[PDB]
Every structure is written in C-alpha cells, then in structure tokens.
Paper text:
The Vtc4p β-tunnel domain is not unique to eukaryotic polyP polymerases but is a structural hallmark of triphosphate tunnel metalloenzymes (TTMs), whose characteristic features are the presence of a topologically closed hydrophilic β-barrel, the preference for triphosphate-containing substrates, and for a divalent metal co-factor (PFAM families CYTH and VTC). Members of the ancient triphosphate tunnel metalloenzyme family can be found in all kingdoms of life. Our comparative analysis defines that most of these enzymes share a common catalytic mechanism in their tunnel centers, yet they have evolved different substrate recognition modes on their tunnel entries. The observed substrate plasticity apparently allows TTM proteins to act on a wide array of enzyme substrates and to perform very different reactions, many of which likely remain to be discovered.
Instead, AtTTM3 has specific, Mg2+ ion-dependent, short-chain polyphosphatase activity as previously reported. As AtTTM3 efficiently hydrolyzes PPPi in the presence of Mg2+ ions only at neutral or basic pH, we used two crystal forms grown at pH 5.0 (form A) and pH 7.5 (form B) to crystallize substrate-metal complexes under non-hydrolyzable and hydrolyzable conditions, respectively. In both crystal forms, we determined structures of AtTTM3 in the presence of PPPi and either MgCl2 or MnCl2. At pH 5.0 (form A) we find a triphosphate moiety bound in the AtTTM3 active site. Here, PPPi coordinates a Mg2+/Mn2+ ion that acts as a bridge between the substrate and the invariant Glu-169AtTTM3. The same metal co-factor coordination has been previously found in a Vtc4p AppNHp-Mn2+ complex. Here, the octahedral coordination of the Mg2+/Mn2+ ion is completed by an glutamate residue (Glu-169AtTTM3, Glu-160ygiF), which is invariant in all TTM proteins characterized thus far.
Author numbering: 0 to 210
Amino acid sequence: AMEVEVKLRLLTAAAHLRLTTLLTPYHLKTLHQRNTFFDTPKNDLSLRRAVLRLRFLQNAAVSAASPSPPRCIVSLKAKPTLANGISRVEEDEEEIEYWIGKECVESPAKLSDIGSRVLKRVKEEYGFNDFLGFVCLGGFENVRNVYEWRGVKLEVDETKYDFGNCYEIECETEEPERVKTMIEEFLTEEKIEFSNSDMTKFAVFRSGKLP
Ligand SMILES: [Mg+2]
C-alpha cells in the first residue's frame, strides 16, 4: 500500500521547543522508538531502493499497573519518493513478538523464523532465498509526539543520532498538498523555522552527519 506523508524539517532545537510547547493542548501520545535496519554488506536492498526496518516502540504513558512488552514492527519500504516536503512510499508492515525482533538484531538469518508475509515479499520481489547474507546496520532512537490538530494527526520527532539531534514534523495524509499548506501557514504565523525535509531518517543515519 502507498504511504503518503508531509515531511518538514524544524531548523533548530529552539524551533522544536516552541512547536511542542504551542501544541501541548493537542497532545494525544508520546512514543519512544528504536529503529533498526537490515541489508547485505553489498547494500543489495539499498541499491534496489528498498528499506527493511525493525522498529521497537513503547508508549511513554503506558499503564504502570498493567505492564506490557514493547511492540515490534517489521516494515518493508519500497520505491520511495521525497520531494517538495512530501514523501510517497510503497509500504508493507506487520507486528511481531518482541523477543524474536531482538534476536533478529543479533542474528538476521532468524528473520526466516517469523513466517511474515512482509519478509516473504522481500524474498519474492528481490530474489533472496533467505536472510543468511544479511547484517543489522544498527539504528537510532526517536521520540515521537503525536497531536490531533485541525483534522489531522501531527507527528513531531526528535531523532537522537550519535552525531546530534534532528527535528521534524510529519503528517500521514491522503491530501498532502492541502495539509502541507495548512501546517506551513501555522508555522509561518508562529515564526517556527522550517524547510522541506529532503532526506529520510534512515538516509541521515547512513550519511553519519546532520543534513
Ligand atoms: Mg516518517
């Protein structure tokens, strides 16, 4: 299925702080995310324009009386396009057990144990028989604040790389041009510095420096 999102970079930590402060009345939830990535040493998926990710996540306001495991989501993102602050990608995703996700980080060959349609599709589309030639590329931490604002769900990200923090606003929408205009009008009125995001979080990670 096609995932479509507005993607804007917040230019400073100060801009990000101003935004999260102003959006506090609209807060829905806060997610702590760890993103991990998988490819061959020869970058076979990356060269075929595919990204294979395991995301581990927890809701920051999870019940203290009723603990639950972190969630683990496997995703395949294919044929991405990112321009003019709009991201479009073919995406397949599935939830998997936390313990198996953790084991796949250390041993990518164990991705075959899951029996996921997502991973089945990786094998079928790109001509892999298994995940024996795969490594975990490592990954990074993201704090995602989610807001219900003017008919849309806003995601405000603080991505914490080894080389520094990056700040973004995202919005998953079937009407990206209309929604981008609405977000930008708000940011402009509030003087919150921004530009189009020209790189995915994974691309920034791989580059090893701030965009
Ligand atoms: Mg995104």
